[PDB]
Coordinates of C-alpha atoms in Angstrom, one line a residue:
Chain A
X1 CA 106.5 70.9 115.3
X2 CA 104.2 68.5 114.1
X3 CA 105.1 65.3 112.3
X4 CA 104.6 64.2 109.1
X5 CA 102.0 61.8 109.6
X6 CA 100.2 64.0 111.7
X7 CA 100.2 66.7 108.7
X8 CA 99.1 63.9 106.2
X9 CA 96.4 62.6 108.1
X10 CA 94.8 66.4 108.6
X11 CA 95.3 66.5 104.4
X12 CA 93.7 62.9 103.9
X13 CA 90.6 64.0 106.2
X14 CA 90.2 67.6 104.4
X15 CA 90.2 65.5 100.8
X16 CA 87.9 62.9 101.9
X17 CA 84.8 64.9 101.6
X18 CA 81.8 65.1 99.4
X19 CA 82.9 68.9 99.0
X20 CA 85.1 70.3 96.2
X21 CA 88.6 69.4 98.2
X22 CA 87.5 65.8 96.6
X23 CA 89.7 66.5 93.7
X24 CA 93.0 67.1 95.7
X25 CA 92.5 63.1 97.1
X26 CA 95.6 62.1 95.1
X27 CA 97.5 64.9 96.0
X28 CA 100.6 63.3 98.7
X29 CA 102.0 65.8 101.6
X30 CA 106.0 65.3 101.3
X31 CA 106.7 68.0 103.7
X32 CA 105.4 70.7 106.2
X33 CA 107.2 73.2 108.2
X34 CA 105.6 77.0 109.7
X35 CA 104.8 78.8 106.4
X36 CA 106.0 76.1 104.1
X37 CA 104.2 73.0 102.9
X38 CA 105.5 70.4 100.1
X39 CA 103.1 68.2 98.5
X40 CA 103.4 65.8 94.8
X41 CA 100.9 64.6 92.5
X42 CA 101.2 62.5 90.0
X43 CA 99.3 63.6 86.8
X44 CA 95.8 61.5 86.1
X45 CA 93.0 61.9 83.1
X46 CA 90.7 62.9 85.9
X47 CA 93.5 66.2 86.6
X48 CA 93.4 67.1 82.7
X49 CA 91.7 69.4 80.1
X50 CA 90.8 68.4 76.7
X51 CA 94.6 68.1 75.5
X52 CA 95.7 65.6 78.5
X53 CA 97.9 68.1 80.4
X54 CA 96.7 69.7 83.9
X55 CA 93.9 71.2 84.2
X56 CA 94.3 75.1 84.7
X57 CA 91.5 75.2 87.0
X58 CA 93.4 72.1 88.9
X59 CA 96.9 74.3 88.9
X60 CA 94.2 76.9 91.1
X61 CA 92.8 74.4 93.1
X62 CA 96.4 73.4 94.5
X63 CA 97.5 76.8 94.4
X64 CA 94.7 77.7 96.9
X65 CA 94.7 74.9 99.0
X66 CA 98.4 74.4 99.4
X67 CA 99.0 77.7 100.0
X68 CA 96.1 77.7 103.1
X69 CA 98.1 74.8 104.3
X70 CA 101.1 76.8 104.8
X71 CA 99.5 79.7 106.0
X72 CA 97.2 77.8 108.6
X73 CA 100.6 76.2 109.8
X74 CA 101.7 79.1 112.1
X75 CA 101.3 80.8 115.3
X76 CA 97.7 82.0 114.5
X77 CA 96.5 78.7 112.4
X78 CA 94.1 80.6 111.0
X79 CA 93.0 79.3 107.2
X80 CA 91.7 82.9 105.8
X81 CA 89.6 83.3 103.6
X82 CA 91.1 84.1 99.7
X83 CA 91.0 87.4 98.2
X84 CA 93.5 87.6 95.9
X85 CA 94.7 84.6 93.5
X86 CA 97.2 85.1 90.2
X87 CA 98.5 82.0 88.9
X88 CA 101.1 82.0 85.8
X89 CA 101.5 79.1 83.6
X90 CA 104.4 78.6 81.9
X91 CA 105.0 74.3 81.0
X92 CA 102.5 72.1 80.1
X93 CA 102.3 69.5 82.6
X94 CA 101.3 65.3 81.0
X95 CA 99.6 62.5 82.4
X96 CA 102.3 59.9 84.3
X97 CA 104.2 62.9 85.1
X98 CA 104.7 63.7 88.4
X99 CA 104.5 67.4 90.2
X100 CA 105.5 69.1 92.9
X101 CA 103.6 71.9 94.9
X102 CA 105.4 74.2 96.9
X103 CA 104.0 76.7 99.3
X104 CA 105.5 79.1 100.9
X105 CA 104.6 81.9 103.0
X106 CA 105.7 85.4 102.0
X107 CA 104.2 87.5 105.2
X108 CA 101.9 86.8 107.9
X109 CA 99.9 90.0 108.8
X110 CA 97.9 91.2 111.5
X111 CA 94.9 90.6 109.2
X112 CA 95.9 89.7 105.6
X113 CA 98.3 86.5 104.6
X114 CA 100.3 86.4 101.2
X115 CA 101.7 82.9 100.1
X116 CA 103.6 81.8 97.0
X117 CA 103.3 78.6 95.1
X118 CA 105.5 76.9 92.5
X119 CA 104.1 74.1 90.5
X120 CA 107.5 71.8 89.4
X121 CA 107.8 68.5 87.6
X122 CA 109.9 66.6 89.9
X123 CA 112.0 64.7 88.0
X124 CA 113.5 67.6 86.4
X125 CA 112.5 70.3 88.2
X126 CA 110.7 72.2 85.4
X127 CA 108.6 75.1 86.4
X128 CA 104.5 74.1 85.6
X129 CA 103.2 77.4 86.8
X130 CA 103.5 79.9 89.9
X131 CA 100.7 81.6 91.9
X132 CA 100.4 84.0 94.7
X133 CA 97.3 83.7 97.1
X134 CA 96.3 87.0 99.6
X135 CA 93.9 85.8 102.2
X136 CA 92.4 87.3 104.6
X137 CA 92.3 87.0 108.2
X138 CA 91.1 89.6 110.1
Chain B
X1 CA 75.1 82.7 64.4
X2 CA 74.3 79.1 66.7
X3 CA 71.4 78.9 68.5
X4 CA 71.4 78.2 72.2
X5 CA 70.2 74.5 71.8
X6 CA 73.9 74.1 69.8
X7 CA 75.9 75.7 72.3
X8 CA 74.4 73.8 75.3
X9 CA 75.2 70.8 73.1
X10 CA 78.8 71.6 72.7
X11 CA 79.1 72.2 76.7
X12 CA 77.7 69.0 77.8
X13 CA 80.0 67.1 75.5
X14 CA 82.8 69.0 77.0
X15 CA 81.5 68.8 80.7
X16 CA 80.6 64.5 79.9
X17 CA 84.2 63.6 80.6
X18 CA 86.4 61.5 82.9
X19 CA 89.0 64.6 83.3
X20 CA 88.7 67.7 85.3
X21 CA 85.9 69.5 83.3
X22 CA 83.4 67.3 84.6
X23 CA 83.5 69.6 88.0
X24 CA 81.2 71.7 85.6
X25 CA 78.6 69.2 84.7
X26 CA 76.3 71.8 86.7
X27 CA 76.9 74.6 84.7
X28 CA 73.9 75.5 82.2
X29 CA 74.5 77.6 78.9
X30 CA 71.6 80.7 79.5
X31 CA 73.2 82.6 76.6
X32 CA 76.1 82.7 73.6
X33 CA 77.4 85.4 71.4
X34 CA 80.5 86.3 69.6
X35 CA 83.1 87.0 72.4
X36 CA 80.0 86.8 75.4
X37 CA 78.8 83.6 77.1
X38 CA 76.7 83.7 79.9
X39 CA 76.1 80.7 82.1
X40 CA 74.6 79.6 85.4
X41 CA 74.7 76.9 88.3
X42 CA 73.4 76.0 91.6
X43 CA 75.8 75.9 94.5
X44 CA 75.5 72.6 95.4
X45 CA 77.9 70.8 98.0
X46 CA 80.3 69.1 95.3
X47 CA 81.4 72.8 94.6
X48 CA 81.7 74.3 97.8
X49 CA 84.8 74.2 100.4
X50 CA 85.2 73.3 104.1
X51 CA 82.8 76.5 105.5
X52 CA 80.2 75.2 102.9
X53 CA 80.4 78.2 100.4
X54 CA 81.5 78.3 96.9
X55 CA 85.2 76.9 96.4
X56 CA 87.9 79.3 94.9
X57 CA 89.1 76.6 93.0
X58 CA 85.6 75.8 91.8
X59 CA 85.4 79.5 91.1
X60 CA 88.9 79.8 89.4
X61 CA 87.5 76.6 87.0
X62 CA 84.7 78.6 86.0
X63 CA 86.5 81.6 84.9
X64 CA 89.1 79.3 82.9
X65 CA 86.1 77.7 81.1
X66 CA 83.5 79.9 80.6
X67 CA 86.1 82.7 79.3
X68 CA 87.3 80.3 77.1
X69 CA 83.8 79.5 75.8
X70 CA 83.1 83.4 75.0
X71 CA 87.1 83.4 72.9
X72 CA 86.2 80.4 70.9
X73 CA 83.2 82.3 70.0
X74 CA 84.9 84.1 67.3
X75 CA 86.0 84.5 63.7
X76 CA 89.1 83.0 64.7
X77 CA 87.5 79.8 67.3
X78 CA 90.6 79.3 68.6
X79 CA 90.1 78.4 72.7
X80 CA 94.3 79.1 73.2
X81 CA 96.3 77.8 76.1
X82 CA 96.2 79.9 79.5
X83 CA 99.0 82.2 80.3
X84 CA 97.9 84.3 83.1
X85 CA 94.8 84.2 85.7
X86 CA 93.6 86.3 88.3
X87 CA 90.8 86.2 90.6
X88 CA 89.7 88.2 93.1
X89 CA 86.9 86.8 95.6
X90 CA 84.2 89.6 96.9
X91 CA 81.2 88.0 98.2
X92 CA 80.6 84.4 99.4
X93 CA 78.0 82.3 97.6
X94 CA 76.1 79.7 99.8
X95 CA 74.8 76.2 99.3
X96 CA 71.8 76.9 97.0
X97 CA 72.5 80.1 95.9
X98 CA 72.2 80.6 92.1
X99 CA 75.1 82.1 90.3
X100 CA 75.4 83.8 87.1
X101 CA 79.1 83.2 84.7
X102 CA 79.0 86.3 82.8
X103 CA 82.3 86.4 80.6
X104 CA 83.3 89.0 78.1
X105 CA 86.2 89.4 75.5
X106 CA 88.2 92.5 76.1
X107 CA 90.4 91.8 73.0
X108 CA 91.3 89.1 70.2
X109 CA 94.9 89.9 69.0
X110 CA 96.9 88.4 66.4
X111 CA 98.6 85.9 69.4
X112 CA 96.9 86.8 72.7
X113 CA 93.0 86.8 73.7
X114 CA 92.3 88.3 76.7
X115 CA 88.4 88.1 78.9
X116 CA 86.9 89.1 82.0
X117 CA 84.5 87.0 84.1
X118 CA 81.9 88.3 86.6
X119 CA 80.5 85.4 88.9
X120 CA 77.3 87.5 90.1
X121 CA 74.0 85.9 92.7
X122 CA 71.4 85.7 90.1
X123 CA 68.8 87.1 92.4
X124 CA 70.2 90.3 93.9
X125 CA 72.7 90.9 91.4
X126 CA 75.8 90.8 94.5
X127 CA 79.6 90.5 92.7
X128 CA 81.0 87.2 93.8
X129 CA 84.1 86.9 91.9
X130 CA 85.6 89.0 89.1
X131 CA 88.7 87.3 87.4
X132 CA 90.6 88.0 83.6
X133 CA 91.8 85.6 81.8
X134 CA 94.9 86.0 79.2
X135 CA 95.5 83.1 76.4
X136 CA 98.1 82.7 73.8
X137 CA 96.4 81.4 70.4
X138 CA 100.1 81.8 68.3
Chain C
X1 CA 81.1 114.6 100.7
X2 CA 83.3 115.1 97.9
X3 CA 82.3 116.5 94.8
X4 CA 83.6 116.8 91.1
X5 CA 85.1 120.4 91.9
X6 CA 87.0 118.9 95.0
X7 CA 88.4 115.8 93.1
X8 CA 89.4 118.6 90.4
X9 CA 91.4 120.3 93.2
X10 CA 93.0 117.6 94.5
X11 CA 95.0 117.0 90.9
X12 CA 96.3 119.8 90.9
X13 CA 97.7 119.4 94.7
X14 CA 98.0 115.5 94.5
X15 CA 100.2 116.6 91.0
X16 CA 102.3 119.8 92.2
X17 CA 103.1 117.3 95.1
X18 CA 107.4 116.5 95.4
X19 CA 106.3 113.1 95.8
X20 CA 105.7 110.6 92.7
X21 CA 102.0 111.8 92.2
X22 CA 103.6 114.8 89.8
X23 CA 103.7 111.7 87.2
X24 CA 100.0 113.2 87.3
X25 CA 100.0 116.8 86.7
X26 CA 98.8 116.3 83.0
X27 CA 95.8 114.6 84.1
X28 CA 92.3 115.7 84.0
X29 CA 89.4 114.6 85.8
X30 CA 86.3 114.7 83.5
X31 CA 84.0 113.3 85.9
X32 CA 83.1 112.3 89.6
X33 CA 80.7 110.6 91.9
X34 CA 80.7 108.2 94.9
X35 CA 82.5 104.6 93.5
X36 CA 83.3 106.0 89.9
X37 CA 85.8 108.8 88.6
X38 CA 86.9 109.1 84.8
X39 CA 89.7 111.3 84.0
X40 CA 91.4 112.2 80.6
X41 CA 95.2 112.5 79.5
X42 CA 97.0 112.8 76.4
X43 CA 99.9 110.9 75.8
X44 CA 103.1 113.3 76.2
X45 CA 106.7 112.1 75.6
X46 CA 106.8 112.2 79.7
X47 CA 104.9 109.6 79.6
X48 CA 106.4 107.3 77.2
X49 CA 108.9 104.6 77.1
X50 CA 112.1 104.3 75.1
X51 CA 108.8 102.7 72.5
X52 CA 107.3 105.6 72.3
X53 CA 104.5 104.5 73.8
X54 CA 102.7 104.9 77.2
X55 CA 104.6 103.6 79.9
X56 CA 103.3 100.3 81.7
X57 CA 104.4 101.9 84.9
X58 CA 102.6 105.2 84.2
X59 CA 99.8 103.0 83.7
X60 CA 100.2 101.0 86.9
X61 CA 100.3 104.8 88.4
X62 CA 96.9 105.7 86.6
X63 CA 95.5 102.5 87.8
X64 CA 96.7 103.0 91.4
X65 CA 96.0 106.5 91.8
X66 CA 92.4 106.6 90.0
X67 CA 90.8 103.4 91.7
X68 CA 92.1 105.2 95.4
X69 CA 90.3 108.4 94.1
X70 CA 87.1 106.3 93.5
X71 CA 87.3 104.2 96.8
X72 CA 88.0 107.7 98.5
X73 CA 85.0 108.8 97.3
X74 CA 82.8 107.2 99.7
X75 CA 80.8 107.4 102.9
X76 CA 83.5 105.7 104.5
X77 CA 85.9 108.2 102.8
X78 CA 89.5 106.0 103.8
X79 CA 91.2 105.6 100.4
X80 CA 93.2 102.6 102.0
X81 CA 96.3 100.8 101.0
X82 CA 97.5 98.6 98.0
X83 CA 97.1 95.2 98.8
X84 CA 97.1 93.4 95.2
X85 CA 97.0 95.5 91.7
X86 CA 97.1 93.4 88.9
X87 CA 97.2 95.1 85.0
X88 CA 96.3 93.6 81.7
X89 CA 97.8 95.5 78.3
X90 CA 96.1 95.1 76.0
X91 CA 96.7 97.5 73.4
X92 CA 99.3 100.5 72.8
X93 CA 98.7 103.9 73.3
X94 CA 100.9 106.7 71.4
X95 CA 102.0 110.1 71.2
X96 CA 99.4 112.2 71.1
X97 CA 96.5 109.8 72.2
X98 CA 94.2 110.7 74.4
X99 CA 93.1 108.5 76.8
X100 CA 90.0 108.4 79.4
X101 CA 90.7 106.5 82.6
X102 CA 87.7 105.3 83.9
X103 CA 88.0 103.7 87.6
X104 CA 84.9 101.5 89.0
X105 CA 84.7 100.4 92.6
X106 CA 83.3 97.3 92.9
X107 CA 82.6 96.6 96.9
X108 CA 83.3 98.9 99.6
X109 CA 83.5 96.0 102.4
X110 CA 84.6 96.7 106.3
X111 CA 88.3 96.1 105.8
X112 CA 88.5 95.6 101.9
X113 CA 87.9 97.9 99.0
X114 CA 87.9 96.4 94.7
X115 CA 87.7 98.4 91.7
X116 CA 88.1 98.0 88.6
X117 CA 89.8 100.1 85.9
X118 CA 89.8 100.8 82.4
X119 CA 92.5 102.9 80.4
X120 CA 90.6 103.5 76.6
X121 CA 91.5 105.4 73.9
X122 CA 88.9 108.3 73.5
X123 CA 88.5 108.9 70.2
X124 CA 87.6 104.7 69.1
X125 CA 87.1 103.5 72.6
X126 CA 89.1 100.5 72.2
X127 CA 90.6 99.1 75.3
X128 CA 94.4 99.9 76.2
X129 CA 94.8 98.2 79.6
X130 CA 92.8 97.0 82.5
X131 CA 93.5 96.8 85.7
X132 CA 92.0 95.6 89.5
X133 CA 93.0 96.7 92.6
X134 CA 92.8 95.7 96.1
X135 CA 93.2 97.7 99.4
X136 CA 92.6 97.4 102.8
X137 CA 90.7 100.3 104.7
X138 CA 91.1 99.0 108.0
Chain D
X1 CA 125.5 90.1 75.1
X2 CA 125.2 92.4 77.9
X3 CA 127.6 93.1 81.0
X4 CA 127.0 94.3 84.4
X5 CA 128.6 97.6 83.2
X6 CA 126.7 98.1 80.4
X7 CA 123.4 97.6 81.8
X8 CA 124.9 100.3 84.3
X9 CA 125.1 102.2 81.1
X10 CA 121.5 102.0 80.3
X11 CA 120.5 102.6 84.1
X12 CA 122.5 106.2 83.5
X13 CA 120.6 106.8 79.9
X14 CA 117.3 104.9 80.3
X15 CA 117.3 107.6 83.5
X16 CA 118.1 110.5 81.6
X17 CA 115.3 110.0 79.4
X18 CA 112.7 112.9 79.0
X19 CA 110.3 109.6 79.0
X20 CA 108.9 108.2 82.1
X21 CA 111.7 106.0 82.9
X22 CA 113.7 109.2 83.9
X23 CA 111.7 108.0 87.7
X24 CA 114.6 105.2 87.9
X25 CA 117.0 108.0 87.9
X26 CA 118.4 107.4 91.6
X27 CA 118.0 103.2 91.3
X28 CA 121.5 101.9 91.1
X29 CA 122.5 98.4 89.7
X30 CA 124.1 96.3 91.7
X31 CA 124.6 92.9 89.8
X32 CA 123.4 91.2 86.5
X33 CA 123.7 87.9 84.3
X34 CA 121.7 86.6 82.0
X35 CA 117.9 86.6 83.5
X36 CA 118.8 88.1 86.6
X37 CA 119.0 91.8 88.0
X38 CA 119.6 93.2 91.2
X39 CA 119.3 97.2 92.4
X40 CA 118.9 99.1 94.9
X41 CA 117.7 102.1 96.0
X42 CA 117.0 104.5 98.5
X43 CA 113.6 105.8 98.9
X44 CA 113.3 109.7 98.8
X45 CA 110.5 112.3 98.5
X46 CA 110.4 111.7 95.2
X47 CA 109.3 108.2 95.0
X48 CA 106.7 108.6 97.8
X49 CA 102.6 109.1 98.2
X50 CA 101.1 111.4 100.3
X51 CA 101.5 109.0 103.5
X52 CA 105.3 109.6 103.2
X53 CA 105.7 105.8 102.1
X54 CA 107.1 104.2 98.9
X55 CA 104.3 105.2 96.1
X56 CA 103.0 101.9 94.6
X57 CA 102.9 103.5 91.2
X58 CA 106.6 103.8 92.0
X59 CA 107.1 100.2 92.7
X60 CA 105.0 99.1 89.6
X61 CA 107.9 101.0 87.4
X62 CA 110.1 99.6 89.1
X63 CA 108.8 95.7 89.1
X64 CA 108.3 96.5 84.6
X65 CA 111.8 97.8 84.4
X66 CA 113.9 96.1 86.3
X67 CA 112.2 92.7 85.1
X68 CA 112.7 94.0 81.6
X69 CA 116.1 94.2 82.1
X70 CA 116.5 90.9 83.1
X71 CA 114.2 89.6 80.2
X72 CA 116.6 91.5 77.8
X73 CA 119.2 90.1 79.4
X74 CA 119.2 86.5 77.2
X75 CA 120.7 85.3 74.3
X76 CA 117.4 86.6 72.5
X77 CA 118.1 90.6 73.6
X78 CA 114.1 91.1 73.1
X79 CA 113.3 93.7 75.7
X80 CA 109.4 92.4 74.7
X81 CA 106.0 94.3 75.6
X82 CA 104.3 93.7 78.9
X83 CA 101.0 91.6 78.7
X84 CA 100.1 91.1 82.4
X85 CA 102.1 92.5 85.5
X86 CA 100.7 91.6 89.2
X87 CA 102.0 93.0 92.0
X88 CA 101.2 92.2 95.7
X89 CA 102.1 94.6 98.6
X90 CA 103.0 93.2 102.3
X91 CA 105.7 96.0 104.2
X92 CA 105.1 99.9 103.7
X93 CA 108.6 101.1 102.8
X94 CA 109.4 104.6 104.6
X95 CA 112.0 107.8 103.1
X96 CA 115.5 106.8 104.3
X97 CA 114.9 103.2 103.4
X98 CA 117.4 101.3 100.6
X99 CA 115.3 98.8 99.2
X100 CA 116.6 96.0 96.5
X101 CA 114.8 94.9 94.0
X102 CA 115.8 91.7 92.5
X103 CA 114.0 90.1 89.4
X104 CA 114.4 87.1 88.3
X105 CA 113.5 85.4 84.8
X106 CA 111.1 82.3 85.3
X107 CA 111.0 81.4 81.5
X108 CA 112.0 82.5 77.9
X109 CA 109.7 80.9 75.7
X110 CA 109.7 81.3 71.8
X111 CA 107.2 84.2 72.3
X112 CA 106.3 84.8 75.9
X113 CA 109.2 85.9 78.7
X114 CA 108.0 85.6 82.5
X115 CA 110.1 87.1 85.5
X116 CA 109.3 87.3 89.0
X117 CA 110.3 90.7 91.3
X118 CA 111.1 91.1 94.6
X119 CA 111.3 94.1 96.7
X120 CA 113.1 94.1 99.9
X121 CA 114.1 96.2 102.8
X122 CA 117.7 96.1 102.3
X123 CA 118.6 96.4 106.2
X124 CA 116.6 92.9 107.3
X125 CA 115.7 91.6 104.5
X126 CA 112.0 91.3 104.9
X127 CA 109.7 91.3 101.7
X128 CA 107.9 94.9 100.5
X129 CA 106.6 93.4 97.3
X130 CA 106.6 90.9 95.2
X131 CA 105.3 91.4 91.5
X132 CA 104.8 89.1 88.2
X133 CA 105.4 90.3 85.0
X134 CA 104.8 88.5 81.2
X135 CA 105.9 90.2 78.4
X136 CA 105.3 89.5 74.7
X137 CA 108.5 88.5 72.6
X138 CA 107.0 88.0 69.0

């Protein structure tokens, strides 16, 4: 298995792009195993809505992208493409606060992938939100 | 009821904005009713992901925000706070592609407003993305 | 092909089945082409829960069942199987309601098929759930 | 509040309902505390589509019940109404097989419940669904 710096370095050069993975740049890979990837984020204005908590569309963003991490991170390494996202939110998440995203894979199928993610603040391990991802892989 | 002129107004001021709404300062009003708002946008490279088409997240960002456009357009103009969202991805758009962000209220309750979004190619009409959208208003 | 008479046939074999499609048996298909089916049911204590009301999982069963008989309905003619179905409620439906249960596909692709469905009640139209489902064909 | 044996009790007359939940007749329960149910069940004729595999109409009733149960469950009691359920399918399950399904309760808010399913195959272990249900307390 790969090491940690290794992982980071793949996530630092996927976020340093002029593409839409731009907004995950702060996001900070913790851990990575074979269908299970655990990043943290703290919080920032630029992550909000209107009220100052995280951005819904933000929640997606790290829904999708962690959950292709863990799903590339197996025997096939294949990323998929999504078909499929639900994402449940259930705590307000503030600025200076600071998240956990955990992704983990539920099956890997000959052609479709299904991966769950649990947004948490880390310091007390509140649940933010939860999504599930089906991607498709042919 | 507002003219368009108002409504694009109200967008920009939402979209001019150091936290995460400014990923829509693309997006251009083309129509506003009571529970309907219908926008469009250029694919451009800020919005798309690695393979250079339209990013889920930027996707899932859209429906979040134009949906909540079309349930603040109401006798009650409350936006709520997201409780559920679902997206599911059809077609790919490409770099330069112009989208339509059709979105619909299915139902204002006396707690819970509830939309659909269609992301459609403006030019042939092909489904992207359909997602719905459920907020809690108390 | 199929045809209206033929989807007409198959609820009453799909519905005198052993199997779970009996929760059926009351329903009636009103209409029928390739992509799109609309059938009609009246609420009946069956179909109830301990509320009185229509049953979420009948619902989900109406949903499921419905869509597949619209995707069916194709060139292709594979009615697939359940990947993702994901229901909104919306609004209760009674005793004695009748409801029309309109099912849309959305894209017939190589390996994927979408639709979309609506439950209404018939006599004002307004909106009791709505559903999407997923399958795979290949 | 509640016991193990008397939810047991409701599993014998929630069953023996002339409503729809009389389709949970042959689930067993297997363990429950406050937010969390476990069941089991062996999949029959009954509970099948046509291919002779747990019908997802089937597993949709059981994902709103048994997630109910474990809603109602709580210091509250509210059983609640279902806003939005999801469910994603990954493993067929066959006649023969005993499947437990497991829900868990996410979040009791002052108006809005949230509870997580899973499905399993009883003999390995491995993951036949996994659904997401919200349900509305006020």
């Amino acid at each position: 298995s790969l090491t940690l710096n290794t992982v980071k370095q793949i996530f630092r050069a996927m976020a340093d792009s002029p593409g839409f993975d731009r907004v995950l740049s702060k996001v900070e890979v913790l851990s990575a195993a074979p269908g299970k990837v655990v990043c943290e984020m703290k919080v920032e204005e630029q992550h909000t809505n209107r009220g100052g908590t995280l951005h819904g569309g933000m929640t997606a963003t790290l829904v999708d992208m962690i959950s292709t991490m863990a799903i590339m991170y197996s025997e096939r390494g294949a990323p998929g493409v999504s078909v499929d996202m639900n994402i449940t939110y259930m705590n307000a998440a503030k600025i200076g606060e600071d998240i956990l995203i955990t992704a983990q894979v539920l099956k890997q199928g000959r052609t479709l992938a299904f991966a769950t993610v649990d947004l948490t603040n880390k310091a007390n391990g509140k649940l933010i939100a939860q999504g599930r991802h089906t991607k498709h892989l042919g």
